[PDB]
Design a protein around this nucleic acid. Sequence first.
DNA 1: ATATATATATATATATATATATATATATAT
DNA 2: ATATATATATATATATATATATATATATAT
Lengths: 94, 335, 246, 99, 212, 198, 233, 134
Amino acid sequence: ISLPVERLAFLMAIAVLNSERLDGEMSEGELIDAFREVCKGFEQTAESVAVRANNAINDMVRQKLLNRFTSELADGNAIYRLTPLGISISDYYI
Amino acid sequence: ELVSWARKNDFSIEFSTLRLSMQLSIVANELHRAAEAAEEGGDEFHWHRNVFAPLKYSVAEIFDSIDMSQRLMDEQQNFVKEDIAALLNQDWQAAIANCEQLLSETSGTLRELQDTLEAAGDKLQANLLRIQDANMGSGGSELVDKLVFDLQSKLDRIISWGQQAIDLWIGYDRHVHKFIRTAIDMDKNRIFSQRLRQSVQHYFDNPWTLTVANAERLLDMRDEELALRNEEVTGELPLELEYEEFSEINDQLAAMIEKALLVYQQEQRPLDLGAVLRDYLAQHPLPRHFDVARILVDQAVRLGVAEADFSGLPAEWLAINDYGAKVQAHVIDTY
Amino acid sequence: IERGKFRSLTLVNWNGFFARTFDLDELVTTLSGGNGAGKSTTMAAFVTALIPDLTLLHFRNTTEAGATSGSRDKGLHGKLRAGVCYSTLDVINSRHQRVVVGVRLQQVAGRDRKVDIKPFMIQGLPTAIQPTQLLTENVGERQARVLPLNELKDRLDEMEGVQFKQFNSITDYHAQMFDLGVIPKRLRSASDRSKFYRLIEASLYGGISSAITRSLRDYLLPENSGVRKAFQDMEAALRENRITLE
Amino acid sequence: LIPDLTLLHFRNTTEAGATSGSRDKGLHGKLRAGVCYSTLDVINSRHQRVVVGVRLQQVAGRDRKVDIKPFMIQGLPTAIQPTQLLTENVGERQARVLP
Amino acid sequence: SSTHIEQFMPVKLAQALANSLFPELDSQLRAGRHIGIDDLDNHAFLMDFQEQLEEFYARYNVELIRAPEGFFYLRPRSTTLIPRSVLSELDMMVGKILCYLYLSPERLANQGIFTSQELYEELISLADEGKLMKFVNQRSSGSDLDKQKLQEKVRTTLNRLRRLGMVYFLPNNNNKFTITEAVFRFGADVRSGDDPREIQLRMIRDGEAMPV
Amino acid sequence: FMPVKLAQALANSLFPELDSQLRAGRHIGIDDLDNHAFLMDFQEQLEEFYARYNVELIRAPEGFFYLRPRSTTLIPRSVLSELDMMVGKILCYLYLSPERLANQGIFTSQELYEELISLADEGKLMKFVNQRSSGSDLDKQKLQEKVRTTLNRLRRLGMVYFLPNNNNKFTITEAVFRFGADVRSGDDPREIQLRMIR
Amino acid sequence: SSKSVANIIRKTIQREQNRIRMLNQGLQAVSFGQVRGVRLNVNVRESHAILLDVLSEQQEQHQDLFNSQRLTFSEAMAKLYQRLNPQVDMGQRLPQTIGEELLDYRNYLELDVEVNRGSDGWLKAESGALSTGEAIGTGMSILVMVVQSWEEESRRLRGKDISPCRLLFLDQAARLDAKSIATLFELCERLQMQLIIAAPENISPEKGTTYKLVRKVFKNHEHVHVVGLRGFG
Amino acid sequence: EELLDYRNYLELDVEVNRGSDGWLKAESGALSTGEAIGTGMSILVMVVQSWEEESRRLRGKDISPCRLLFLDQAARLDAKSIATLFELCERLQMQLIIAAPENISPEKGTTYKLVRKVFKNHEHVHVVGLRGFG
DNA sequence: ATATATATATATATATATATATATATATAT
DNA sequence: ATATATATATATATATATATATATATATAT
Ligand SMILES: Nc1ncnc2c1ncn2[C@@H]1O[C@H](COP(=O)(O)OP(=O)(O)OP(=O)(O)O)[C@@H](O)[C@H]1O
Ligand SMILES: [Mg+2]
């Protein structure tokens, strides 16, 4: 369990979008967009946007924060969902 | 916008279906009670204590609980995939039956969960629409509508996932079989796999390369290089914008004619364009005459119609001045 | 909220215009003048500044609006003088930020009446700097000269607080304009750009555009992916069923 | 002048050359129920006063169809106007068009 | 009789060569592209007229070969009328790794969709990091700049193999891909349980694989 | 089915080699007697056969045949470098009339190298080798090597027939006219070719 | 799968119908010639409602059509649409393309423009039955609704503090009379819409800014002179 | 059959002396609205003249067919162009019917003012006529 | 002695398939 | 880090095939 400010903010944005998502599904094509926006707000460019986004998504997935599902038809060919621990961490503040 | 909020915050660091059924029953009872309370009606305080405190908190919490149950099933889905993957590493050809069972049970569990979800989604939606209908019982019930608008999606969203997850699993399942039908059928003993691993590890002890057809590409003629036009154009830069003003003489003339003509409408006097134009043009010099005639007509034709125009008898071209000006119009009678 | 606005339009080295800036009105700006005065030329220069997509740009006469003329020429090339030309728009953001977008145009030497376009943007320009002057260098006695993109970049870079950018794709140019509340819709795809140009082009000639009415469904109603997904799901199911039957 | 249904298509001024889009030609809606007439009067180089014209009728039906019949008249007095020929000055306020 | 197709060509070969699918398949094949079960139309076309096309291509001194896995390709001869070329050693490393991923059940959850990062991670896991890096640059010593260079080289080789049909980028994503059965050729040196040095001599004799 | 004479043409034993050389972009002139005669005979069908590939089989006014890929060409296309067209135009110029007394149809790499150096502008030479270059020995050696490479590439296309030996001395074929400019009534071939080169 | 499909299409259609019907009230009885008001009519197509019904409940009955090796899915759908509801009498368009067209939900709605011409009520707007000015005003109305829709859709992406610019054009404005122009001005101002209009003569002397252009031959080339104009003096 | 026609042997073009430049082919894309309209009118009158010339030899020598043309939305033209058109049509003995929503006020010829109203629950067009001015 | 039904021809315009040109992404190479 | 080549997608215009609706001449009922 290690959530820097950017990762935590990305998680909160993801939760907000899921709340405003119609059917409660999140393809990675939108996760990357959310990460782009949060990193832009936080004003830091260690590497490219894509590599940082991929690393962060993988880190949360392995940190038991997101669940990934392989769906070719989905935008980005994957569907992501908040895990119960991620839900708890997000709603702890929300 | 939430990014600044997070930045300034500065922070950092049960799959049983009987459960789902009992939460669904509780939700049905509470939702029906709240809908009936709303339908009965009451004052603002009654409306509140019956549709905002009981409903809001209870429905939010229990929909969240149901969603958490779905997430726990999702976690179980992930874990069973991982378990199958690990099993195929340990038994290879002998785990086929085990994996098929696990797939069967997981699919069945998914079927029961979807069935339980759809067992009450429609009626709960009906109750929510009933609460929507009863919401309008007061003008201050705006917040209720939000919930009656929010609590919709969640429910439907939940049901959506109940199928979408399944849509995913029935896919994954197939893939697994293909693997068993493809990966292990030609590697029953798995020896080929180990031998490939050792070949990879010790490839450069005997570096070999395959041969592939490498037909030539059809070389083409490069299109002529494009050269733009450069001429270093120079010229005088424009001065400050001048200005001109519009003459309202025609406006004054129109006002004069409208005032002179309003009397005809006032008295409903039959207007004859010939005589009126002939009389009025005498007040102006000839070059302006046209610009007068037009305006007068514009003012005159808005005042009633001419009844003779339905008689089928064409009107004549009455002269209205010297120099040869003529007009064709019936008398304006019907104001 | 205060909506952004178009302040002015600047034309450089155009057919008839050397360097002319018309200041727009908050509600209505009108142009008058006899036939062939160049009003049509002005609208063309504007829209070019807005949508520099050369494929979409096609200046048919008001007559034969949408009727194929077989001229093979889009009509833009003859509207420009030899050498460099510019078309720029000043816009005040709802954030009350003065941003100058623009495009450099240049005829391509050769029998083909083809042209090159390079978009560009400037942010933070001081309110006192007028585009007409910013794009021109006063050389000689009251005989200002136009300066190319390299010269313009050098001039701007020399000044402080102004951000100049040049875009390699009209896509990014559109993205930035959308970012600054210049464009209602995000022209992510070429189809987006085509629809946009369709809208503006119809307005220019005015009245009922056949394409607009025919595609009203597309233009008004948004696209939905969930329906597409459900259809694809059906497709997979049917394909499997046919496989089994065969 | 040209009473041919195939050629007659009153597209709006806008879209002077664009496709049909719809099926209608725009003529039917310009008429009124009943029998209508459109007539020209001409004076030849021979100074013969000739009245050419067409009778129109909105063909009743599901569609907006029109029937057109041409005709010509010669030897008319210069003093008689076309409207008089085609309309009966009945006692009612408004005249009556005759077939 | 005269004016009769059989005078010159078998009927089925002429029908195959006049089929709409023939040109694209031929261009891809001559380019070196392998054909798998996924291209159902092209694969079925090859199955139907397999013999006609092998005998046709024999005129070019190149063998149309169907591996037991069921994927067709071309092997030029020393007297090939169509030029021939050999894959790089890095290409071999990546091809062997792809065969592993095709056969690896651990990544089954991926369901066949893989990212270049995962491929690189697996490659470095099984291979020798620095001694493999030696080939990327002779003056590499673990420098992260050279690390990025190796990642980029792996990406380029992956693109090339995609060109050969061994891998498909996803209809919308060029950063994710799906493996094809053609990759099995990278294991042809180990598909037979014999001495590696004899399988290598057999393969090189067959023209399957040259040395370096 | 298939056209019968098209089937006859494809079956001809010359077809494999000719097809490979065409798909490689090579130009078949009058020198290749068998191939040129075959193409003359069976053009009406090879044009259709290669149109099935979204390519056009063109017989030049000079007579030589070649393949022009369309935008939708099914044969992987490629584009010649700038130096490639420059060298092609140099040879087209050298397909001159005084050439007969100059080299009797046999040129050497030195002739081409000197002509290119004297005739071309420095900026394009640097663009060929590299922008940052400025009149150096290494740059000139690389330029000469690239000249040799493009000469080999032209040989691949059939533009230039090497005289058989390791040494670089060759002859120029008529197909080189592809690089040439159009000829009008009374125009000097030298003047138009040089104007194009300039 | 078919049942679920039909369901999602139905939901999407209902949502969009409601949204458009709510939007319709953004218009206030524009005055253009005999046109007194403009409106958008959205209605599910019964020819398509029948299709939805069959898909949702009687998919199996026509499996014969679906499972034909000759027909692709789009072609299968087109053939089914043909089988039922054959009186529509579609044209010579290929089954393929019509099928894909069917694969779009929006197609299932008749989306039409209604005008309150004179006292004839609301009638379908056909260019062939409208005066030039009437048609021009109708168009401008349509374009303004479209831009409003685009802006609304982008509300989510855009920041809360930015309202995109609004600007349209009209060449050869002389085609319009004073009343129509005044109607257009009131509409545009109500909608905060900027406008650039052209006409040889100054048709709008009393509103917005005005400029007058004159082209002069000058040293064997051309120059345009611009002069400002003012409503009153 | 195309070759069988002499007309096909001929290439026909329309050229205009635009401004300081010489004669250029009239491209619809290279002209302003009024210029295009005027050129079209010119060509129309040319066609009319050609057709009359063709038909005369099959007609009585004392027959001069009527000539009459239209121009809707004439407001697209300026006064200068309109006067040029009037002069041209007069010089060619050709009658014109031009429509303008009150924007222009051509002094010469007949003018007809129109207004639509409702009367007896029916649309009516009140009409007025003027002429002789100038 | 007249008016309606048939067959023919024609232009309309509808749709498809083709070919072109431009923009884009992006992978290479200096 | 950026110039350049290559593949892909879209819009646009051309050309052709084809169905539709109308006009014209003849046939046949009244
Ligand atoms: N591409 C071009 N090539 C040559 N001349 C052109 C071109 N575009 C415009 N012109 C000429 O430039 C002048 C300006 O035309 P433009 O249509 O812009 O003027 P205008 O005042 O709007 O005219 P109108 O109202 O008649 O359309 C006219 O002479 C036109 O012929
Ligand atoms: Mg103009």
